């Protein structure tokens, strides 16, 4: 979470804007959160089944 925040932070506070073209970096935080989600997600249900 904090990661994504840092990116959105470096999106406005970055040396000016209205021209910055990029987005590949965000992909990082994006993919990771997904993997982590589904992992502990169904995992939580497991420790709940008991």
Ligand X SMILES: O=S(=O)(O)O[C@@H]1[C@@H](O)[C@H](OS(=O)(=O)O)[C@@H](CO[C@H]2O[C@H](CO[C@H]3O[C@H](CO)[C@@H](O)[C@H](OS(=O)(=O)O)[C@H]3OS(=O)(=O)O)[C@@H](O)[C@H](O)[C@H]2O)O[C@@H]1O
- Contact between 50 and a copy of itself per CB under 8 A: no
Minimum Å gap between C-beta 16 and a copy of itself is 4
Q: Which stretch binds ligand X (CB under 6 A): 12-20, 30-38, 41-49?
A: 30-38
Question: Helical H runs in the chain?
Answer: 2-12, 24-49
Burial 27-36 (b: 16+ CB within 10 A, else e): eebeeeeeee
The C-alpha angle 21, 31, 34, rounded to 5 degrees, equals 140
9 binds, among ligand X, a copy of itself, none (CB under 5 to 8 A by kind): none
Q: Which stretch binds ligand X (CB under 6 A): 11-19, 31-39, 42-50?
A: 31-39
């Amino acid at each position: 979470e904090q990661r994504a925040i840092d990116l959105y932070k470096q999106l406005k506070h970055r040396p000016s804007d209205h021209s910055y073209s990029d987005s590949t970096e965000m992909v990082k935080i994006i993919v990771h959160t997904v993997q982590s989600q589904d992992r502990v997600l169904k995992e939580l249900f497991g420790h709940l089944s008991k």
